[PDB]
Amino acid sequence: RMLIFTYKLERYIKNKILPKILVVPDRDKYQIKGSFRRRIPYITDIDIVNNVHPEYDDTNIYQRIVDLINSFTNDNQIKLIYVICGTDDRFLLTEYSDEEIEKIKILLNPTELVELNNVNKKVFYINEIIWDLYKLRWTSSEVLAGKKILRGGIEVSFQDVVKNNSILLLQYFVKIEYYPIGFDIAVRYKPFYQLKLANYSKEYYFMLFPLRFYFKNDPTISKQLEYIIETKFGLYKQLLVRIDSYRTIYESGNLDLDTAKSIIISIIKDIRKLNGIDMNIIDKIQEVSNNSAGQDKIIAWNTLLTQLYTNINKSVNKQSKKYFTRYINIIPKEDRKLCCL
Numbered sequence: 001r002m003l004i005f006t007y008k009l010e011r012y013i014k015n016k017i018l019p020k021i022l023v024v025p026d027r028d029k030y031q032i033k034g035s036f037r038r039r040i041p042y043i044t045d046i047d048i049v050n051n052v053h054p055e056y057d058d059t060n061i062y063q064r065i066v067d068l069i070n071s072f073t074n075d076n077q078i079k080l081i082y083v084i085c086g087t088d089d090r091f092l093l094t095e096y097s098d099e100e101i102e103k104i105k106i107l108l109n110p111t112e113l114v115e116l117n118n119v120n121k122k123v124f125y126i127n128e129i130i131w132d133l134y135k136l137r138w139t140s141s142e143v144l145a146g147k148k149i150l151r152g153g154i155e156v157s158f159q160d161v162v163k164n165n166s167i168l169l170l171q172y173f174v175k176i177e178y179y180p181i182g183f184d185i186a187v188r189y190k191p192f193y194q195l196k197l198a199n200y201s202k203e204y205y206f207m208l209f210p211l212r213f214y215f216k217n218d219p220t221i222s223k224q225l226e227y228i229i230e231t232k233f234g235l236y237k238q239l240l241v242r243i244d245s246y247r248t249i250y251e252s253g254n255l256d257l258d259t260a261k262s263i264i265i266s267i268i269k270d271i272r273k274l275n276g277i278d279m280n281i282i283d284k285i286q287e288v289s290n291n292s293a294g295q296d297k298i299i300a301w302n303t304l305l306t307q308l309y310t311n312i313n314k315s316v317n318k319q320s321k322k323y324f325t326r327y328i329n330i331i332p333k334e335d336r337k338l339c340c341l
């Protein structure tokens, strides 16, 4: 039932999906990156680099994206949510006490902003707010229209953006089996922070990731860490990503009831395989599915998935603390300070 890696699935992806969503389908012109390249058992998403020059360049890449978009209009399995290309430099801060001020005029909610101006490495929640504003995320209709309106009413055109950039990102969601899966395609048409243990509070599961990088060239330890992260706790991570998929699709304004329901159904089934979960959250989700309807249901679910998200994090971090302490103690105290760069 669950979406697990198999070669039947990989072949289906490479044969039936990729030729449809890639700018250049030729196998020699694309590379699979990230977790899918490692063929992790609990598939989360697919990351791909598409090197399309000289086949495609500044002068014809737009029309090829238009072709892709149009080919999907009547395809219920594939949706191109965002085309990411360009930046809005007005949100290019210099992180100076005076920089910030000059941007508030174009923000709506700077309470959240001032509610975390408190206090040098917390630029993380600053960029966490303005990232979507700095990086231009084009919708399909904005791409087809060929123009985009920015905050404050500033006008921008897609052709200008491609001419001033070397790469664009296609953000797809694809219904592979029972629910949507993210496909991120980095399209190159012209010729990191989460690795520091210092930037973590006590998210012990995610703090294993810097450790895995540290021990990447140690066979015995890298196998153990890979097993722990990807198999023992693999489903915890997959469920977090799957909840992010709901959120992302919903926030973009493209989640219909049928898709929301398929996601919620898959989560209810799989959540029972986990340990330490407040199953009351699950019961609350079922009661929504019973006494709400249409959009109100989608919204109520979104709200409840947020609690569930928190709960899953809490649980996996708790069950992970010992594996962290174990492997961190393998590193010398002098070096364990600034793991791992």
Ligand SMILES: [Mg+2]
Residues within 6 Å of the ligand: 072, 073, 074, 075, 076, 077, 078, 079, 080
């Ligand atoms: Mg579609």
Ligand SMILES: [Mn+2]
Residues within 6 Å of the ligand: 034, 035, 036, 044, 045, 046, 047
């Ligand atoms: Mn990935």
Ligand SMILES: [Mn+2]
Residues within 6 Å of the ligand: 045, 046, 047, 182, 184
């Ligand atoms: Mn991705």
